[PDB]
Symmetry: D2
Subunit: 124 residues, 4 copies
């Protein structure tokens, strides 16, 4: 993976959330997420995918991952997906937009999905 080295490691967003991820050569993302907003009780499993061979034209690397907000300790009956791109260099960043869907009845489904944006940096 071109950016396997670049992506693997600890990232921090503008909320102070911590995203720990290993990028496989096959395009796999695996790791843990800890949200600053709502320790092992605050860590949730993440899986996702990234482009292992980006276009060498200065483009970022497209990627995405999901966290379902259930662990051994708590269950918030919701899942967030982040969609964005990794940009390498001195101020390496993951620029994302996210969707947070909560389990609802059919009547409440219209109010089920939050949208936002997180920027991840290598320094907190």
């Amino acid at each position: 993976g071109r950016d396997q080295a670049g992506i693997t490691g600890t990232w921090y967003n503008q909320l102070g959330s911590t995203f720990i991820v290993t990028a496989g050569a096959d395009g796999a993302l695996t790791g843990t997420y800890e949200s600053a907003v709502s320790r092992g009780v605050r860590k949730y499993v993440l899986t996702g995918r990234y482009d292992s061979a980006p276009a060498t034209d200065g483009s970022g690397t497209a990627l995405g991952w999901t966290v379902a907000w259930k662990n051994n300790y708590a269950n918030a009956h919701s899942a967030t997906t982040w969609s964005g791109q990794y940009v390498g260099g001195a101020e390496a960043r993951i620029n994302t937009q996210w969707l947070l869907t909560v389990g609802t009845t059919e009547a409440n489904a219209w109010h089920s999905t939050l949208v936002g944006h997180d920027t991840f940096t290598k320094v907190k």
Copy 2:
């Protein structure tokens, strides 16, 4: 997983895309996606997560998954995340909203992310 049985299997969206997924007891989603829009050359790996213990109050099951649009045959330098909920019963459905991010230069990043919505059914 409460809906491990319900989620596992083949799903079809309003575009005719085919989503093949196995739901693990630990909340893992794994499988393949084939988009009707842009065979083994058209299959892409998906990973994701779902709530393995939803609230028993009639709520859907929150879930998400990612497809990076690279396989052994093609690379579209992009990733889609779907965020939504599974609803069981006679007309079982996965109601999703999605984000499709393409690798771009910093100048083009403003134009990097499409948003949409897919409804998956068990019949095409």
Copy 3:
């Protein structure tokens, strides 16, 4: 066009969108949400492409409702972005963003996203 757009539209929730499309690209009207009479009517304003591409493309448009009227204030605003498609099964296909006034701490939870399809028959 202005002919196709002007009039009464209904979404999958049973909400009612009453809109007049001006020659200048203006949308003006009232929105009534099935979810949250005159107590449930809110002012909408917006814009549409008054000269769409004549290649069978839809007509791009958007409008905003702030959820304050003489009776109620929900300290929120929805914008719909989408396109009008004419013909026998005329439709406005939209995605929307609903933002509630929050403190800085709650801003991350401030915006709902969804999609509404409006038809000329409920």
Copy 4:
């Protein structure tokens, strides 16, 4: 309020949003995008909560730009949904939806999503 909102705002792209907020909740103005003079100015209309919650919450608002003017037509419309926060570092924090007129076949690819932060100094 109408005082805080009325005036000139700049986003992280260098785009310029000129808006007047009416007492009735109306937004009227012009938008000039840094990306895609009078040839680059487009009409905007929108709404804001004219009586926000006095608990330190932002003021919900939205507006629409259809990308047609006397000079150019890009067959598209953007809506911004967000909130105004007053004080020394006054801001309009938004998410937006950009929809282009497409055929039914291309509708799946019709809508871009993003986020713009507007400040009183560029």
